[PDB]
Design a protein around this ligand. Structure first.
Ligand SMILES: [K+]
Ligand SMILES: [K+]
Ligand SMILES: [K+]
Ligand SMILES: [K+]
Ligand SMILES: [Mg+2]
Ligand SMILES: [Mg+2]
Ligand SMILES: [Mg+2]
Ligand SMILES: [Mg+2]
Ligand SMILES: [Mg+2]
Ligand SMILES: [Mg+2]
Ligand SMILES: [Mg+2]
Ligand SMILES: [Mg+2]
Ligand SMILES: [Mg+2]
Ligand SMILES: [Mg+2]
Ligand SMILES: [Mg+2]
Ligand SMILES: [Mg+2]
Ligand SMILES: [Mg+2]
Ligand SMILES: [Mg+2]
Ligand SMILES: [Mg+2]
Ligand code: NA
Ligand code: NA
Ligand code: NA
Lengths: 107, 128, 56, 141, 47, 77
RNA sequence: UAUCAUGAGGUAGAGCGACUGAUUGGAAGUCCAGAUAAACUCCGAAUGCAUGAUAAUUGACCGAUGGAGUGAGGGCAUGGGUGCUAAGGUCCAUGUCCGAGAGGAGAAGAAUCCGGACCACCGGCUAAGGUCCCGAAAUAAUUGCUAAGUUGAAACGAAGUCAAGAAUUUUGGCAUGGAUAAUACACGGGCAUAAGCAAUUUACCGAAGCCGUGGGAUAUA
RNA sequence: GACUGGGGUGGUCGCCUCCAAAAGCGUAACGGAGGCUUCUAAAGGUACCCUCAGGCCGAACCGGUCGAGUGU
RNA sequence: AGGUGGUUAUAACGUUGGGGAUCCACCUCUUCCCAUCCGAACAGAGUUAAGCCCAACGGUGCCGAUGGUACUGCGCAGUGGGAGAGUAGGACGCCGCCGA
């Protein structure tokens, strides 16, 4: 068992429930050993509507979440849905989600 | 180690056509292999003295009246379950590239051997 | 176009689906002739009752 | 007896032999053989009698193969037993065969008396047979 | 071994019918279920 | 002698009730099955006994995917 | 009912180093090669079924109400179980006929072949099957085979005879031996060397079927 | 009491699963095989996290390649 | 050289060779967030060997004709349907979105 198949299993389980549409789009978050990414996706035509990235680091993650919220408000997205994307909802994931909540992104 | 066979083109297909061809004391045959397309033709039972024969007799130089001439080997023969007559023949066209696979009789330590048309790739025959 | 179908054999001992096909064609008597457009549906009925009819 | 040591079910429905054999109709492993021209059930007693007949001849050279195995159980009712009330007493095993199926085959033997040994075997069977030879065999051994 | 017992302490009355294995649970069950009179309340066994 | 057999149970009338291409209404039963022989898709629910039913009206669609898994969905509007 | 379009199958067949259970050699594993199954499946039809749209066709499909009878079935064909791959046996399924159905051929037969009778006729055409006499219509024409009066049941033997081949040998056509009990026996009979068998062509006979003529009745328009 | 290849003797009588069943549903036999007359305070609900069973190697244990369980 | 999808593996597995200002990954440390006997995983604050990506190989797996044959509808071998296996061969993916 490697981290790739572990995270693929978790991703499949989460995508079992979560899905995004033209309203209420999916909010994927990528975390690496350094930097972080966030992406807002419509899972019908496979079109991403907004994104943010990094380009401690809890502040960096919160700034990334606030930037994603700013992009969502610029593009006109009120409600979203957020998927764990293979990561336990704790640490940087929790901080980014809290920052996106403190911004717009009514979810 | 070189046979000569003649054939005539086949047009109709299906079980009715095959029954008519076999009632005229003939065998449907197909030649395929290499690149490009293949051909479907008619062989005669009397014209065949190849499969009912002790040695390999490969390199069946074929002349079909609907096309040119070729060289091939016995690839598949279909027999009747009861009368044990031939009902269908399939030929593998042989080219100088990608040497063919053959089965060659053994002696005692000697074989028939093959180098022209088929460079290599023998398997066995009557290993006992 | 128009084709003529004539019943030449009896419907006795024929299955009910064939009897109903004869009715749908409009043949109720022996040596009866009906005239129909040669549509694929009509041709299918004629195919179903081919052993009882003649194209005249 | 020639029969399996175990079977999942002790009983079997009498099937229906339908057409010609599409497998086991060509001669592998050997040179001469006999094919059946009819559809029938073949008992182990008949098989053993035929093999004993074919092996009393031919001395002990060559090799003999039987290519059918009896694995279908059959029953019989009995004397004074009326119809109904389930299946009867077991009565052995049979092999169902169709036309074109090779029963017996021989190898390593001259043709002229292989033709006689196989006929001796075929006279102890309830089916009409046909002698077959390999389609590569030559007269000079 | 299995038996039917009732939940009580309503508010008319509120009862819930339910089975329990006595040898597995010698004690008395206590679950907060509901009261159609007002709202949620604890309900205990022994009828 | 006697037979130790002779028992059976009543048949459960399983199978596909609404085939692909038909029109279904909300609550219509589509498939009776033992286990997910077919799986639910869009606007199709599954019950306690793995019964497939339509959440919305529309047209029944049968589709196959990897592992040759069959899915049943309702196409509306 | 037919055509088209869409959909789900796991039967026939097939295959089983694609599983489970059997099986064969093999060279307790393993490798290679046979092969098997109602309660095996990596596969997988033809038909059947469902929905929709057209066409043809009746007309009787559906609701509600008045009146019932039936709830001992049977034969044949197909798919099966059972039995002994027995029974004019028995139990299911799909059709059909007798039941409740007359007429024609098969000598004479409930359901095999042809064919569904409103009544009359001293009219005509056909179906199955026939055209030497009993008995309606060809002792018609042409081409072969049979010599057994065969004609109008098997393993297994000579091969009597014709025909087609291959390198003794195969192959089919027609015959022949195997071929068998008790009131007298059979092509229905006479009888026939064709008036037997196989093929083709044309005329003709042939039913209560169809047409014609006269006369009624019952409904839908 | 009834069923019953006459009756008696024996066996059977309600429910569940497979085959008979002929690729929709349904379909008989004193046809071929088996089970039930319960259980769980978690063996229910939910969030999160894991992956059997087997063969070789080395000595219940470390590592590398393809049936187990689901109370009955 | 990342992420995120639609296409039932013609898309998977394997073998061999090539990769680094930064993209990913390995990589040091457990004080607090959290966590298992074990910071191995989960949780945070010198590298291209390996994961990963690129390419070549028809090897292991997948796909797979034409013809023939089996089977089959029509209450007849006349009129229709038509496999499975196998043999040729095909194949080391294709269509998007965001990012730098
Ligand atoms: K007679
Ligand atoms: K006369
Ligand atoms: K029991
Ligand atoms: K084909
Ligand atoms: Mg059942
Ligand atoms: Mg079968
Ligand atoms: Mg059916
Ligand atoms: Mg009664
Ligand atoms: Mg009755
Ligand atoms: Mg009877
Ligand atoms: Mg019978
Ligand atoms: Mg009566
Ligand atoms: Mg009647
Ligand atoms: Mg009569
Ligand atoms: Mg006349
Ligand atoms: Mg008359
Ligand atoms: Mg009349
Ligand atoms: Mg009684
Ligand atoms: Mg069914
Ligand atoms: Na029953
Ligand atoms: Na195929
Ligand atoms: Na194949």
């Amino acid at each position: 068992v490697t981290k790739e198949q572990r995270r693929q299993k978790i991703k499949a389980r989460v995508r079992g429930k979560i899905s995004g549409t033209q309203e209420k789009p999916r909010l994927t978050v990528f975390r690496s050993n350094k930097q972080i990414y966030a992406q807002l996706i419509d899972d019908i035509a496979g079109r991403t509507l907004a994104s943010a990235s990094s380009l401690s680091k809890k502040e960096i993650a919160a700034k990334v979440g606030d930037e994603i919220a700013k992009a969502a408000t610029e593009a006109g997205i009120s409600t979203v849905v957020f998927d764990r994307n293979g990561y336990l909802f704790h640490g940087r994931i929790k901080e980014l989600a809290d920052a996106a909540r403190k911004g717009g992104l009514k979810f | 180690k070189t046979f000569q066979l003649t054939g005539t083109p086949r047009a109709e297909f299906g079980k009715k056509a095959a029954k008519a061809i076999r009632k005229e004391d003939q065998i449907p045959a197909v030649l395929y292999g290499g690149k490009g397309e293949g051909v479907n033709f008619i062989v005669s039972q009397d014209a065949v003295r190849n499969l009912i024969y002790s040695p390999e007799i490969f390199l069946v130089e074929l002349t079909v009246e609907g096309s040119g001439s070729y060289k091939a080997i016995l690839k598949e023969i279909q027999f009747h379950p009861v009368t044990d007559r031939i009902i269908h023949i399939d030929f593998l066209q042989v080219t100088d590239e990608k040497p063919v696979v053959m089965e060659v009789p053994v002696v005692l330590g000697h074989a028939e051997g093959v180098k022209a048309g088929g460079k290599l790739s023998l398997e066995m025959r009557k290993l006992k | 176009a128009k084709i003529k179908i004539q019943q030449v054999r009896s419907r006795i001992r024929c299955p009910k689906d064939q009897k109903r096909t004869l009715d749908a064609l409009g043949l109720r008597k022996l040596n009866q002739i009906v005239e129909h457009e040669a549509t694929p549906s009509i041709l299918g009925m004629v195919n179903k009752v081919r052993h009882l009819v003649l194209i005249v | 007896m020639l029969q399996p040591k175990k079977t999942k079910f002790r009983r079997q429905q009498k099937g229906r032999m339908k057409g010609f054999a599409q497998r086991g109709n060509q001669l592998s492993f050997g040179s001469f053989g006999i094919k059946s021209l009819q559809s029938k059930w073949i008992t182990g007693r008949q098989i053993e009698a035929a093999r004993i007949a074919v092996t009393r001849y031919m001395q002990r050279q060559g090799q003999v193969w039987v290519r059918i195995f009896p694995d279908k159980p059959i029953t019989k009712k009995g004397e004074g037993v009326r119809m109904g009330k389930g299946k009867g007493a077991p009565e052995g095993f049979v092999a169902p065969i169709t036309p074109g199926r090779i029963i017996f085959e021989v190898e390593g033997v001259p043709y002229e008396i292989a033709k006689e040994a196989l006929r001796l075997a075929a006279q102890k069977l309830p089916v009409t047979t046909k002698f077959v030879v390999r389609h590569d065999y030559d007269i000079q051994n | 071994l299995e038996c039917t017992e009732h939940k009580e302490s309503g508010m008319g009355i509120s009862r819930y019918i339910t089975t329990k294995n006595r040898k597995n649970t010698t004690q008395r069950l206590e679950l907060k279920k509901y009261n159609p009179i007002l709202r949620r309340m604890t309900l205990h066994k022994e009828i | 002698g006697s037979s130790k057999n002779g028992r059976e149970s009543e048949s459960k009338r399983l199978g596909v009730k609404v085939y692909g291409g038909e029109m279904a209404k909300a609550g219509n039963i589509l498939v009776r099955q033992r286990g997910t022989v077919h799986h639910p898709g869009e606007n199709v629910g599954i019950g306690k006994d793995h019964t497939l039913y339509a959440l919305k009206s529309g047209v029944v669609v049968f589709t196959r995917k990897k592992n040759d898994r069959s899915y049943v969905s309702i196409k509306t509007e």
